[PDB]
């Protein structure tokens, strides 16, 4: 079942892609002191 996979980010798109373009800029800018990296999931598929 692809649609449930994509919605829960079991497969389909890493956090660098489905996140809004503005938020990715924010996370990269403030990674030194306030990190948002571990909140979002990146699917890895064999």
């Amino acid at each position: 079942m692809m649609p449930q996979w994509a919605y829960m980010h079991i497969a389909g798109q890493d956090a660098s892609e489905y996140l809004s373009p503005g938020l990715v800029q924010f996370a990269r800018a403030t990674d030194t002191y306030f990190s948002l990296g571990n909140k979002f999931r990146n699917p890895t598929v064999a």
Partner: peptide
């Protein structure tokens, strides 16, 4: 826009490193 929030290592902000990731399972 959001570059003003990053520490400056000179005349350029300290940004990059697209590691906004998470992959943590027993595998």
């Amino acid at each position: 826009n959001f570059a003003s929030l990053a520490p400056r290592h000179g005349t350029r902000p300290f940004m990059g490193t697209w590691n906004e990731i998470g992959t943590s399972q027993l595998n």
